[PDB]
């Protein structure tokens, strides 16, 4: 079977390699804003707060591997 895949999963691990620079392997307000900051201007703290609150359903503002595995997989049927 397709036991040894490592096709798409290789790109998930890349997130904790290109997105985070602290060596934590988690997505917080810091990594969420740093990319936008050098992509299309950084929003206000309030806007950033709401953004991480709109993703972190656990209530800590941090996404680990187990969370990321579901976050970057449960795509909606509608595209923005």
């Amino acid at each position: 079977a397709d036991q040894l895949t490592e096709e798409q999963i290789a790109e998930f691990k890349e997130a904790f390699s290109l997105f985070d620079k602290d060596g934590d392997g988690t997505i917080t307000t810091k990594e969420l804003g740093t990319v936008m900051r050098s992509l299309g201007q950084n929003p206000t703290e309030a806007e950033l707060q709401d953004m991480i609150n709109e993703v972190d359903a656990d209530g800590n503002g941090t996404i680990d591997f187990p969370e990321f595995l579901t976050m970057m997989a449960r795509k909606m049927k509608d595209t923005d």
Binding site: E11, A15, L39, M51, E54, M72, M76
Partner: peptide, 19 residues
């Protein structure tokens, strides 16, 4: 939504992975 604004930076990551 964050679930879209998250995929966006990831798309940038994909671009970096290519570049």
């Amino acid at each position: 939504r964050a679930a879209n604004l998250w995929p966006s930076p990831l798309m940038i990551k994909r671009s970096k992975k290519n570049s």
